[PDB]
Symmetry: C3
């Protein structure tokens, strides 16, 4: 009744590097929201920036129970940050609409990385 | 509120080593009867075993006891709902124990990358 | 009841070794609480001990939304264990007070390790 779903994702930087090589310059544009893409050039570690967002979006998609499908899409799931640096989700309008319809009230996020591994942790509440 | 949380990471190489030590009987000791029905057809059997092992260890940590008593590999079953979300199903001894503790719902998420399988579990009371 | 925040951390044992090597015992003196620092000489696996505490404290600081800041400090975030071995937090008095001011009622902890990777997950409620 409290938790709608939980999600975790572990993403290797190597995996992101291979995807970015395979799909070329267009890859970032397929995984990132327009806001994320606008701020990507200022990332200190671009590969890590993509990997974190990739992991966060997959973990989100698990926490809401559907996987990447329909409105639960890379382009609709954006990661932003509050004034203290805490990561938080911001949604394309098709996804905020879907979330309200599912009764999902809020979705929390945490991320970490170490060496070649990025980790995301998501909890969706009712 | 939350009763507890649990997490576990499992090496695919480790599961391989455990298979060699105990033979195919290892799977018979980690998996439930229902899991054992589809296990012979599993396309990636090391990954299949690793996921179940990690999930069951995480479950055991999330209920605060570890693998002990009714909290045992053979009582902790993983299934999936219609959309592919993993979810737990319990043997009778474990389902009773959980309810005795007031634990109402246990949620599960799994991920894997290269050699690492990761499970995270939240038990709610 | 609701979630205040969630936190995760992954920590490499090799990174801990590097940190011990550069700073010597001053690293443990910076990360451990006075209580933990007294029992550290008895840890059967001092690198694994420091790694778990480091990951748990970092995940804690994320779960309360601040990072390491103010009273949310390494020296105020302690790890103990209950009778069955379940890990749990204890707090320096200033942090206990802050948690109470914030309405945080319970912070849950889980840890795991495999090979070089130590992992911590934390959920702060209310
Ligand atoms: C779930 C998803 C986000 C990721 O799948 P993945 O990263 O390949 O798989 P992971 O190893 O991280 O985790 C898989 C686990 O997800 C979990 N999962 C699957 N479907 C799920 C769902 N609907 N809800 C919650 N969890 C789910 C399962 O536990 C699965 O492991 P199991 O089946 O062995 O239990 C999926 O929705 C997807 O579409 N992946 C492809 C993403 C993609 O498009 N990449 C290309 C970039 S353009
Ligand atoms: C605790 C257990 C669940 C996991 O053992 P493990 O995998 O070695 O433990 P992990 O390394 O995953 O995580 C260790 C952490 O578990 C946590 N933990 C221990 N007991 C716990 C408990 N009762 N409740 C919650 N968390 C617990 C602790 O934080 C511990 O690390 P710390 O003591 O350093 O803080 C154990 O009971 C277990 O089941 N081991 C293997 C089971 C087995 O039989 N394997 C052979 C195949 S038959
Ligand atoms: C938050 C903190 C713990 C980050 O730890 P880290 O190991 O540097 O970085 P990790 O990769 O583990 O985690 C980084 C993520 O923490 C998260 N984070 C940052 N500020 C946060 C906050 N206020 N609340 C919650 N999460 C936060 C972000 O998601 C960040 O990644 P992003 O910016 O790419 O989104 C760190 O910034 C901090 O606040 N204090 C550490 C200072 C310190 O003492 N270092 C060691 C000295 S021995």
């Amino acid at each position: 009744a409290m938790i709608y779903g939980i999600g975790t994702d572990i993403v290797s930087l190597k995996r992101i590097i291979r995807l970015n090589k395979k799909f070329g310059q267009a890859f970032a544009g397929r995984i990132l929201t327009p806001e994320e893409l606008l701020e990507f050039p200022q990332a200190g570690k671009p590969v890590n920036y993509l990997a974190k967002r990739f992991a966060a979006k997959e973990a989100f998609a698990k926490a809401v129970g559907t996987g990447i499908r329909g409105a639960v899409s890379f382009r609709n799931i954006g990661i932003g940050h509050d004034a203290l640096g805490k990561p938080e989700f911001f949604y394309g309008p098709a996804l905020s609409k879907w979330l309200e319809e599912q009764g999902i009230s809020r979705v929390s996020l945490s991320m970490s990385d170490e060496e070649d591994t990025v980790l995301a942790f998501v909890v969706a509440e009712k």
